[PDB]
Specification:
The structure is a homodimer. With 137 residues, the first copy, chain A, is of the alpha/beta class. Chain A has one domain: Rossmann fold. Chain A contains six helices and five strands, in the order E-H-E-H-E-H-H-E-H-H-E. The N and C termini of chain A lie far apart (42 Å). The interface between A and B is large, with 55 and 56 residues. The structure holds calcium ion (3 copies). One calcium ion binds next to strand 2 of chain A. The site of one calcium ion (CA) has 2 residues of chain A, from strand 2. It is classed as transferase. The entry lists the keywords 4 stranded parallel BETA-SHEET flanked by 3 ALPHA-HELICES on each side, transferase.
């Protein structure tokens, strides 16, 4: 089954995962990594690899991060570079991660969707799910 | 000062503020609401209304929910629909909030950006922030 690793600053990863459980009832094969104040980013790389390895079942791993170009994103990309080219081509990194994206990801987990096709699907959803509303509409 | 109310299923709203705190330091005028397994949605209605009121200061309020068309969102709308006219015109609801949208919101809070203008900018950055990277982009 597709693996998911949500990596972020603070407890955002645990929260996104908590929110998905409230909506779905349960979740499976989803690890969360947190970068806290005073954490050495040197170690984040290690926690991200451990997590990826803990969800790899042979269908790839979706590494969902919070902020493009921030530490979680950087370390994720850098760790991927040091893995066997085999899974290396099955690991995708999505940024700007939001609940709709995590839900879409879980959806592909259940569907068995090939990760490359899943990644695009998640990116579309995420973007399309960002809109504003006001009383004038 | 612009007010912000992050409302989500579970602890997501608290995790977003924590993450944003980790990056920008101590924030101000940000309320977090949660909808947990078992909670009554009407109660969430009042919870949002309260958060909105504890943060409303003349410059409007950004209500950041997690998912479009779900209880947090639907209740935000129901609440805003029954608010006194001088207040409702300035409350905006943005969906699919991610860390970048929150950080962007905190920035407009500091700039004093007019809310209708801040909302459009938060949506643009939010959409722009969603991307995917894979080893093929680095392989030649
Ligand atoms: Ca964890
Ligand atoms: Ca709160
Ligand atoms: Ca008060």
């Amino acid at each position: 089954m597709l693996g998911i690793v949500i990596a972020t600053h603070g407890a955002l990863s645990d929260g996104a995962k908590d929110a998905a459980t409230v909506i779905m009832g349960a979740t499976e094969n989803i690890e969360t990594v947190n970068l806290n104040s005073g954490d050495d980013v040197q170690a984040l790389g290690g926690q991200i690899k451990t997590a990826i390895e803990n969800v790899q079942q042979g269908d790839g791993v979706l590494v969902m991060v919070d902020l493009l170009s921030a530490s979680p994103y950087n370390q994720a990309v850098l760790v991927i570079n040091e893995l066997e080219p085999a899974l290396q081509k099955k690991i995708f990194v999505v940024s700007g991660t939001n609940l709709p994206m995590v839900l879409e990801a879980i959806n592909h987990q259940l569907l068995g969707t090939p990760i490359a096709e899943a990644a695009q699907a998640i990116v579309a959803q995420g973007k399309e799910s960002v809109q504003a509303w006001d009383i004038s509409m």
